[PDB]
Amino acid sequence: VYIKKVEARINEEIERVMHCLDKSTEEPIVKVVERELISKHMKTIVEMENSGLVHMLKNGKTEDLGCMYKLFSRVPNGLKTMCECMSSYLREQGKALVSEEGEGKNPVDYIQGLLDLKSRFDRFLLESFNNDRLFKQTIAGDFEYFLNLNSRSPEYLSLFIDDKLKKGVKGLTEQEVETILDKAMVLFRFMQEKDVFERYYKQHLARRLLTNKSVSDDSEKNMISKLKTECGCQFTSKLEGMFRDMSISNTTMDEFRQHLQATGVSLGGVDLTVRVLTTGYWPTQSATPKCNIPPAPRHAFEIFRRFYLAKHSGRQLTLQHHMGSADLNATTRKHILQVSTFQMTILMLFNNREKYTFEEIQQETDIPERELVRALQSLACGKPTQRVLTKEPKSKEIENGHIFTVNDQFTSKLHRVKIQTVAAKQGESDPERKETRQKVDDDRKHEIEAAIVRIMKSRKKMQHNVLVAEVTQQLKARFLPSPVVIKKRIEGLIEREYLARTPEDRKVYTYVA
C-alpha cells in the first residue's frame, strides 16, 4: 500500500504546485521529492520482507508489478536494481528447478515446467513492464546463465520436443501447437551446447521415422523451417537428407513390389516393408549383430538384397537386427502379435521346437550379449497381464535352466496387439550417456579441426594466442571454447604437412597446401 500512497502524494503535490504556485515551479520540486522518497525507499522496500518485490512477483500480482514499473521509471537507477532483484529471484527459481540431486524426474515434465515459467515471466513482462529492453536483456542473460549450467538440459529439451512431435493429442488444433513451438524455440534460444542438442534431435528423428509412420506428416516442415531460422543451414540439411533417404526407401519398396509381382508374387516376402538408408546420415554404424534369420525372412532378405545390389550396382546390403519391426500372425481367434526384430529368432526357434531355455537360445543361434538380455527381459520379465511368453520359475532375475511357455491372454480386444516394452520411461543409463558423451566429444574435436583448416587458410598467422580467440568466437554459438582441449589439439598437427604450425618458428606459418 505504500506505493499507492506515495503516488497519491506525488499527484496531490504536483496538482498543488501547478494550481497554487507559479507556471513552471515543478523541476526542482519533483526532483527533490523523488530523491527523498524513491531514492531512499528503493533499497529496502523491494527486498527486506513482507511482500516486497520477490513475494509480489511469486504470487503473480500484475497490478503491483505495473505500478512499481510506472513509479520507479521516473527515478534513475531504479530499473537497474529492479532488474537485479528480478534476476536474483530468477536464479533462485532456476536453481530450485534445475536441481540435479535426486533421480526419478520426468524430462518432459521438467521441460514443460521450464516453458511454463518462461511463459509466465513473458506474460508478466508484457502486462507490466511494457516490453522494456532492460528487463528482456536481464531475463535473457539469466536464462543463458542458469540453463547452460546443466549439460543434460539439451537432452531433456529434445525429449520434450519429441514428446510434443510424436502425436498432437494435447492441443489438436494448430494455433496452440504453433505457440508452444515458438515458446520452445525461444527457450532454446537462451541455451548453449547446441552439439548435444542436435545429436539428440537426430537420434529422436531416427527413433520416430524408423517406427510407425503417420505421426504428423506436416509438422516436419515446420520443424525444419524453425531449425533454419534458429540453427541455420548446417545439420538441418542432413536431417532433410535422411528424410530424402526415407523417400528413396519408399520408392524402392514400391519398385521392388512391382518387380516381385512380375517375377511371381514373392510368398516369403508377402509384405516386405524393407527400408534402405545410408550409413553417413543415420547413426547405424553398429549394424552387424550377425544372428540366424528365420527361414522365410532369410529368403526374403536375400531376394531383396539381390534386387537392390543389382538395381544400384555396389549395394552391399549389410544385415542387422537392431531396427525395424514385424507383425506375427498368431492363432479362439487369430490375433496378430508384433515383434521389433528382437524376438523373431527366439519365437522362430520356439516354433521349430518348444520347451527351450537360456542355453538353447544361447548355443545354436549366435546371439550377442546385452541385446539378448534386453529382449529376454522384455519378453518375460516385467510383463502386465498380456504375457505372450511365460515361464515356470517365476522370478525377477534371469536364470539359465528355465522353460518357456505361451499363454492365451484373451484380454486383447482386437486382432492387432503389440508388445511395446521398448521406448519405456526415459532412464538415460550410465553406459549410453558415457558413449554418447564420447561421441559428441569426438564430434567437437573433429569440428574444431575442420573449422581451423577451413578458416586459417585465408587468414593471418598467430604468435601466441591470436587466432585462438577468432576460432573460439566462431564457435561461441556452438559450445564452450574448451581452451585446454583446443590447445592440446592444435599442436597435434605439427607431425606432418598442411600448416604444421611449427611452435619454434611461430613467426611465420606455411601458407601452402
Partner: protein
C-alpha cells in the same frame, strides 16, 4: 504352425565403395594407420588418424581425405562433392 510371420519391416544399410581391405586414397586398409602415419604410437596421442565418412558413403582415413581437400575435391571414386557426415568406423 502356431506362429507365422506375415509382415517384415527390416531396414537395409549399404555403402558405395569403401573397400575395407584398402583406402582408395592410400591403399593400406580402411583401418591401421595411413601412408603419412606409419608407426601406430610414435607421437600420436591416441592416434588422431580416424576414418572419414562422406555423404557419398565412401570411406577413407581422415588424413587421406584431408590432403585432397586442398586441390579439387570431387570424391575421386564418383562425381559427388565430398562432405563429412561421420567420424569413426
Amino acid at each position: 504352425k502356431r506362429f507365422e510371420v506375415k509382415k517384415w519391416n527390416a531396414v537395409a544399410l549399404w555403402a558405395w565403395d569403401i573397400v575395407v581391405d584398402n583406402c582408395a586414397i592410400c591403399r593400406n586398409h580402411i583401418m591401421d594407420l595411413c601412408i603419412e602415419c606409419q608407426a601406430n604410437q610414435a607421437s600420436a596421442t591416441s592416434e588422431e588418424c580416424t576414418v572419414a565418412w562422406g555423404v557419398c558413403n565412401h570411406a577413407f582415413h581422415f588424413h587421406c581425405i584431408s590432403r585432397w581437400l586442398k586441390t579439387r575435391q570431387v570424391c575421386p571414386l564418383d562425381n559427388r562433392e565430398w562432405e563429412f557426415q561421420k567420424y569413426g568406423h
